[PDB]
Amino acid sequence: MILDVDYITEEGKPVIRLFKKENGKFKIEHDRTFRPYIYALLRDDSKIEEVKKITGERHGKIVRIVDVEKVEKKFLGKPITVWKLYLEHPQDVPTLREKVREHPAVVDIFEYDIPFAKRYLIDKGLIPMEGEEELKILAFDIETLYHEGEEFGKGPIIMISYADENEARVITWKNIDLPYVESVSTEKEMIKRFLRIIREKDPDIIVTYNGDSFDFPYLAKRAEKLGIKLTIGRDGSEPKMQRIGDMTAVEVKGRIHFDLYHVIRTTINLPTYTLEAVYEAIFGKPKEKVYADEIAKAWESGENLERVAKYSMEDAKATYELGKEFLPMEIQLSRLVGQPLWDVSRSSTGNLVEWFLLRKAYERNEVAPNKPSEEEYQRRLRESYTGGFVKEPEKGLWENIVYLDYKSLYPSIIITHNVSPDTLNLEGCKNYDIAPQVGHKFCKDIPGFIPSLLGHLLEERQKIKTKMKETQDPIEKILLDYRQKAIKLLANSFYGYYGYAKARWYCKECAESVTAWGRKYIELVWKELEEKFGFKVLYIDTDGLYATIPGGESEEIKKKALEFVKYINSKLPGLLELEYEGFYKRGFFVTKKRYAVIDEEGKVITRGLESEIAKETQARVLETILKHGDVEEAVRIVKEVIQKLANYEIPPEKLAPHVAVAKKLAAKGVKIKPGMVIGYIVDAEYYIENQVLPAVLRILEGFGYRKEDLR
């Protein structure tokens, strides 16, 4: 197996190193028969002897242009010949190139900014995390004392916890009568246990949580000070900070520092991403947090520290557990992409796709277009591309509603009309379809670079969804489940790619035509659904829509629906396809992205809607409409409220303005600052107006009523 790749310089020369993991062995391969490079497009290959002499001048030394044999590739489909001008060090590159696009004989230069080790795995076809070796996973978190003010690292490290598959400890330097804490004389020794531990344990992957930004550099700052090498890599070297997106990461030699944070912050969209926030969302249970309740430590070394311990063993076990979960996704994106996980982990899906293409461009012998200049890229931030539908809803309480899904509408549009910058209004094609409203024309005589790739992603995703339904090893099954969810994440992000400012394969027209092609099928389904099948369409949304037959009998609407889906697929082109998503006993659609519904089994989904006078009231409202089908009873419920408020009869309990009550807490040494737990309590025109009404008032526009009377 592979884990990583980087290069060292052994004097004026670059060397690739491979961290392989191999049958309980761990090691290093250095390869030195590999060299840096770029392409030059040329005026007349004849110059070749003129455009080699190009000198540089780096480090107080002379860069030059080593060996330069001629090659034949393809660009956007078109065969085209060019000059592979090789080099010596990948740093000879940033110093050579400008001299070259600035030479009269050269038209363009290409692939001039690919990091070396990345260029290495792609050109040699190597894929990281490939095997099926048992990686050793270890997670850890640390706990501090946020001093009176803010330096970062004046607060000692109160605790150091860690976790894995056998246990989860906490290492600390105070006394705590717990079976899973380990006490050690000082904070110097705490750090040492930790080091000795990663030594006995020796993990291949170390999992943290915002350890990039916190756990790791806190540790460092707090040792460049206490006289202790953070001997954490496998070559017995310390964690090292590395540049990435503008923010700043930590690679750890021989092991893989995988920082949960950057990874979660993607799949499931989330209000906040506190560990607790995250830990809940994915397996339910709950946690505990908002601190500086470290009083247990500070003078006032009162117990309760027993509490705090519990919490560290927690920060970890949680961290470990999400890691085990969110990790296979990333192992897989790394695998599809052909790059390394400390890397893969830290890049937008936008980017994973780009490496997905640099790699599929080498494999099929196609020069990669260059990234955008600052200017071409300045434009792009120019907006408004164009995304499909959202038309307004047939208002009203409806019942026996049916929801119809498009099986991956965009990956499907792209594949079917061969939408691609490289098929785009290409000259003299003989076969071609035309983008609905904007006339862009995508040729059809030849697959299209992204279309064939996408088609192949979708085709391998079916071989996995299919093999699963067949498998009894539950190990193979979850693993396959992983392969698929990744291909899926990836296949689904090409749309946005086309729209990406920095995509090398930018093509806003490819993006407009999909969106637009998107509108035409929706409609069509919408027509057909209403005309040929007598349904009233209730509300369309970018991939699908809700429908029914007013007053219609319910296990008929289902069956007419079922029926209509097989009617339509036969009318839809290539691989466009609708599917039957769900049946909801009732629902109503206020407007654009506000609406609600409940299924045959009492569950309520609502997006766009949702104090405790409102909370309790907006919900009684909801029950009545959904569960008991009644609009009156609920106004009948806003009323018996707008009136217990102007009558004044409701527990002083459902109310829990800012700033304002660090107005009495000022006695308790309660030196509150914008980061201290506070679940604090706080008109008539209020409660009824700034409060109750707006929260029951959106739902209701939906039936026309209005604040007045309501009052």
Q: Which residues bind Mn ion (CB under 5 A)?
A: 4, 141, 315, 340
User: How far is Cα 421 from Cα 410, in angstroms, rounded to an integer?
Assistant: 15
Q: Are 242 and 233 in contact (CB under 8 A)?
A: no
Residue 107 CA to residue 52 CA, distance in Å, equals 15
Q: Which is nearer to Mn ion, 344 or 641 (CB)?
A: 344
Least distance (Å) from Mn ion to the CB of residue 256?
A: 8
Q: Would you mind telling me the total number of residues written for the chain in this entry?
A: 711
* Residue 312 Cβ vs Mn ion, minimum distance, rounded to whole Å: 7
Q: Which is nearer to Mn ion, 4 or 294 (CB)?
A: 4
Backbone angles phi, psi at 508, to 5 degrees: -55, -25
According to DSSP, the residues that pair with 139 across neighbouring strands are 163, 207
Q: How far is the CB of 158 from Mn ion (least distance, A)?
A: 10
Shortest gap between Cβ of 120 and Mn ion (angstroms)?
A: 11
Which one, 242 or 266, has the nearer CB to Mn ion?
242
When the beta carbons of 2 and 109 are compared against Mn ion, the nearer one is: 2
At residue 490, φ and ψ (nearest 5 deg) are: -60, -50
What φ, ψ does residue 429 adopt, rounded to 5°? -75, 165
As a whole number of angstroms, the distance between CA 522 and CA 578 comes to 10
**What are the DSSP calls for 254-321, one per residue?**
TBEEEEHHHHHTTSS--S---HHHHHHHHH----------GGGTSSS--S-HHHHHHHHHHHHHHHHH
Task: Tell me how far apart the alpha carbons of residues 535 and 513 are, in angstroms, rounded to a whole number.
Answer: 29
Closer to Mn ion by Cβ: residue 141 or 422: 141
Q: What burial letters (b/e) apply to 71-100, b meaning 16+ CB within 10 Å?
A: eebbbbbeeeebbbbebbbbbbbebbbeeb
Q: Which is nearer to Mn ion, 4 or 187 (CB)?
A: 4
Q: Which helix (H) or strand (E) holds 323?
A: helix 305-337
Among residues 36 and 340, whose Cβ is nearest to Mn ion? 340
**Dihedral, 230, 236, 241, 244 alpha carbons, nearest 10:** -150
Least distance (Å) between residue 314 CB and Mn ion: 9
Distances (CA, A) of 537 to 242, 531, 533, 541, 570: 54, 11, 11, 12, 21
DSSP state of 367: P
- C-alpha 476, offset from chain centre: 25
Pairing of strands 205-208, 137-143: parallel
Compute the least distance from the CB of residue 359 to Mn ion, in Å.
16
- Looking at the Cβ atoms of 150 and 200, the one nearer to Mn ion is 150
Residue 384: half-sphere exposure toward Cβ, Cα within 13 Å? 0
The distance of closest approach from Cβ of residue 11 to Mn ion in the complex, given in angstroms and rounded to an integer, is 22
The answer to whether the CB of 257 falls within 8 A of the CB of 319 is: no
Which tokens go with 281? 């969302």
Nearer of residues 340 and 518 to Mn ion, judged by Cβ: 340
Q: How far, in Å, CA of 19 to CA of 33, rounded? A: 18
Least CB distance from residue 4 to Mn ion, whole Å? 4
Q: How far is the CB of 218 from Mn ion (least distance, A)?
A: 10
Minimum Å distance from CB 464 to Mn ion? Answer: 28
Q: At its nearest, how many Å lie between Mn ion and the CB of residue 128?
A: 9
In terms of CB distance, is 340 or 544 closer to Mn ion?
340
Helices and strands, counts by H and E, the chain: 20, 23
Q: Which two tokens stand for residue 83?
A: 């000059």
Q: How far apart are alpha carbons 586 and 622 in whole angstroms?
A: 12
Shortest distance, position 5 Cβ to Mn ion, whole Å: 6
CB nearer to Mn ion: pick between 255 and 440? 255
Q: Which is nearer to Mn ion, 4 or 366 (CB)?
A: 4
Residue in the structure block whose two tokens are 């219609």: 552
CB-nearer residue toward Mn ion: 159 or 557: 159
Minimum distance from CB of 14 to Mn ion (Å)?
Answer: 15
